[PDB]
Amino acid sequence: GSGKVVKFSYMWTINNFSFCREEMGEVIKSSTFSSGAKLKWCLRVNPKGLDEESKDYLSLYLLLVSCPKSEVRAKFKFSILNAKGEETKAMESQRAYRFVQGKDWGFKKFIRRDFLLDEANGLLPDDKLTLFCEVSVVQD
């Protein structure tokens, strides 16, 4: 039986998000997670932007930690799960992107910090930020 894990969704919750005082360009890595049957990945968020261009934004990235071959091609979608558990503020890679070991792809301006704070009741229940990343692996 020749099989492959072609799709997977990773949910990541960052507690006491308001306590995350990392400055522009500082990052928060999630633990590394694998997809199955080979590939290792992790998420990276910049609470206060990666750079000036994104100073008022939270930056979100998908990193390919390891792959058996030279590269991996994949489509991805990032979103936030709200208080009611529903998806919101979704952004998706239009096409698939070419990942290689140690390289990431994502959105530099995924969502504005002031918006996240203003809607804290809904987007930061108990001051917890829950991120959702759905990936589509098209080539291994």
Binding site: N46, Y61, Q94, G102, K103, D104, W105, G106, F107, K108
Partner: peptide, 8 residues
């Protein structure tokens, strides 16, 4: 569009 890398 506007998907970018923070590693590369």
């Amino acid at each position: 569009p506007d998907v970018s890398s923070s590693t590369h």
